[PDB]
Amino acid sequence: FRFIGSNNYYMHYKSNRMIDSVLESARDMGIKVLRIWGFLDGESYCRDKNTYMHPEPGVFGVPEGISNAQNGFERLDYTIAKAKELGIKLIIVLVNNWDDFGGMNQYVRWFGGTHHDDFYRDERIKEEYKKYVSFLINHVNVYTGVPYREEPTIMAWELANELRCETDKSGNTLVEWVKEMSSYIKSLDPNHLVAVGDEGFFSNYEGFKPYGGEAEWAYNGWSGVDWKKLLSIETVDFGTFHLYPSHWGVSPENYAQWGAKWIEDHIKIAKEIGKPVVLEEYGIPKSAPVNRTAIYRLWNDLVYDLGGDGAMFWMLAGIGEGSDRDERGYYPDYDGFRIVNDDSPEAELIREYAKLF
Ligand SMILES: OC[C@H]1O[C@H](O[C@H]2[C@H](O)[C@@H](O)[C@@H](O)O[C@@H]2CO)[C@H](O)[C@@H](O)[C@@H]1O
Ligand SMILES: OC[C@H]1O[C@H](O[C@H]2[C@H](O)[C@@H](O)[C@@H](O)O[C@@H]2CO)[C@H](O)[C@@H](O)[C@@H]1O
C-alpha cells in the first residue's frame, strides 16, 4: 500500500455537507488516505465549536445538562461511515502537541501542572490520556455498528500530532512516553497500525546535517525528538515526518532542496530500520516567491522514486458555510496551504500523482 494522502482537521465538528465535500473531493482526486483529528480537549474549545469530545477529565461527549450541542464522536462516526462508503482510509490523531483544540496544555491545566511537557511525565495526566484513548478506540460507531477497534476504514492510530519535549533534549522522555502509549494502544486494539504523528526531527546523527546549514535545530535534537529511536520502538509500525521549510528558518531559494534532503534522509533511515515511512504533512505557503507546484512535484517524485510509502499534503478542504466561507463559497484558506478540488496547478498535480502511487 503506497498512496497520495492529505489532512483535514474539521471532520469531527463541521456539518454533513461540509464533511461529504471533503471526502467526495478526496475520492474525485484519487487521494486514498486522509489524516484527521480525533480530539477536542477542554470545555472552552468544545464550547467554541459547540461540539464536545473531552471537555473535562472523565467526561467523554456532551456534559449532562448541556443541550443542543454536537457530540464529536457522532461527527467522527459520520466521517468514518462516509469515508467507508467512499473508499477513503483515515489516520486518526489522538491529542495535539499544540493548543488548538486544547492539546497537551489543556491536560496540564486540568491537572494543575506548570509546563506543557508535564503531559508526558504526570501519571495523572497519562492516566487521563489513556482513559480517553480507550473510550475512543472502544467507541461503537452509531452509523455502522462497528467499534473503531474493528473498523478497517481506520488505517492507523497516531499518538500525538507534532509532539515535542523541549525540556528533555536527550530524547528519552518521548521515547519512554511513546513506548508506554503505543504498547497501551496495542493492548486495546491488536488490529490497527500505530504511529507517533511527530514531525521527524533528528538528534545529531553522524553524517546527517541540514541542507545549506539552515534549520539546524530540526537536525540537532532541539525539540527532544529522536526520530530514529522512536521508529525503533517495537509497538510503532511506521515512521511519520512533516515538512514546512517556511516555518523552520529555511530561505525560500532553499525550500526545494532542503525539503529534498529531508525526504531522502528520512527514507534512508527508515529503510535501514525496515519499517514504512510516510511524509504525512508538507506545505509551502501560497505566497512564497518560488513555484509551489514545482516544489510539490519534486517532493512527491522523490518519495515515489526512493520507495517511501506515502506523501500527504497539508491540507485539503471542501465547500464552506456560515463564517467559514470565502469569496468562492469554499472553506477559507486561513494558513496559505489550503488545496481544493479546483483548476489550480497544485490540484492538477495531486490528481496526476494520485494515478501513479
Ligand atoms: O434518510 C436517508 C439518510 O439521509 C441523510 O443521508 C444523506 C447523507 O448524509 C449524504 O451523504 C448523501 O448520502 O445523501 C443522503 C440522503 O439521501 C442522513 O444523513 C441519514 O442519517 C439518513 O440515513
Ligand atoms: O505546521 C506545524 C507548525 O506548528 C507550530 O505552530 C503552532 C503554534 O505555535 C501554536 O501556537 C498553535 O496554537 O498552532 C500552531 C500549530 O501549527 C510551529 O511554529 C512549527 O515549527 C510547526 O511547523
| DSSP code string of 88-120 | -EEEEE--BSSSTTSHHHHHHHHTT-SSTTHHH
Contact 225, 163 (CB under 8 A): yes
CA of 16 to the centre of ligand 1 (A): 9
One-letter identity of residue 89: K
CA of 78 to the centre of ligand 1 (A): 10
* Beta strand 277-282 pairing with 310-313: parallel
Sign of the dihedral through C-alpha 112, 113, 115, 120: negative
Contact 163, 198 (CB under 8 A): yes
Dist CA 86 CA 67 (whole Å) = 32
Dist CA 348 CA 311 (whole Å) = 16
C-alpha cell read off for 23:
471526502
Cα first-last separation, the chain: 9
H helices, E strands: number in the chain: 12, 10
Secondary structure element (H or E) that encloses residue 245, with its range: helix 245-248
What b-and-e string marks burial along 238-274, b requiring 16 or more CB atoms within 10 Å of the CB?
bbbbbbbbbebebeeebbbebbbbbbebbbebbeeee
What's the CA dihedral at 334, 338, 341, 343 to 10 degrees?
100
- 16, 70, 78, 79: which to mutate for ligand 1, most atoms within 8 A of CB? 16
C-alpha cell read off for 126:
497519562
Which ligand minimizes its atom distance to the CA of 96? 2
**Around Cβ 188, how many Cβ atoms within 10 Å?**
16
Dist CA 121 CA 246 (whole Å) = 32
Hey, which bits of 138-198 come out as E strands?
Answer: 154-158, 193-195
| Planar angle of CA 81, 86, 91, nearest 5 degrees | 65
Structure-determination technique: X-ray
Write out residues with Cβ below 6 Å of ligand 2.
98-100, 162, 244, 247-248
Which CATH number characterizes residue 129's domain? 3.20.20.80
Sign of the dihedral through C-alpha 287, 290, 294, 295: negative
Hey, which bits of 218-299 come out as E strands?
Answer: 239-243, 277-282
Q: Whose CA is nearest to atom 16 of ligand 2?
A: 98
One-letter identity of residue 192: H
With H, G, I as helix, E, B as strand and everything else as coil, classify residue 158: strand
With H, G, I as helix, E, B as strand and everything else as coil, classify residue 262: helix
Dist CA 86 CA 244 (whole Å) = 30
Dist CA 262 CA 212 (whole Å) = 12
What's the CA dihedral at 332, 318, 90, 41 to 10 degrees?
40
Give the up-direction half-sphere exposure of residue 89: CA atoms within 13 A in the CB hemisphere: 17
Give the up-direction half-sphere exposure of residue 327: CA atoms within 13 A in the CB hemisphere: 2
Residues 6+ apart with CB under 8 A from 53: 12, 39, 40, 41, 46, 60, 61, 71, 72, 73
Closest CA to 268 of 202, 221, 338: 202
Secondary structure element (H or E) that encloses residue 175, with its range: helix 172-188
Dist CA 13 CA 323 (whole Å) = 14
Long-range contacts of 107-115 (CB under 8 A, 24+ apart): 107/41, 109/42, 110/56, 110/57, 111/57, 115/167
* 213: region left, alpha or beta (phi > 0 left; psi from -120 to 50 alpha): left
Contact 288, 324 (CB under 8 A): no
One-letter identity of residue 354: A
Dist CA 9 CA 15 (whole Å) = 13
Q: Whose CA is nearest to atom 10 of ligand 2?
A: 98
Helical pair 103-110 and 123-137, crossing angle rounded to 10 deg = 120
The range of the structural domain enclosing residue 87 comes to 1-357
One-letter identity of residue 100: D
Closest CA to 76 of 25, 146, 5, 162: 146
Q: Which residues are catalytic?
A: 162, 281
Residue 235 buriedness (CB in 10 A; 0-12 / 13-18 / 19+): middle
Closest CA to 13 of 35, 36, 43: 36
Sign of the dihedral through C-alpha 225, 122, 107, 89: positive
Closest CA to 162 of 98, 117, 235: 98
Contact 137, 175 (CB under 8 A): no
Hey, which bits of the chain come out as E strands?
Answer: 3-7, 33-37, 51-52, 70-71, 89-93, 154-158, 193-195, 239-243, 277-282, 310-313
* Beta strand 89-93 pairing with 70-71: unpaired
For the chain, the domain total comes to: 1
Closest CA to 213 of 257, 279, 243: 257
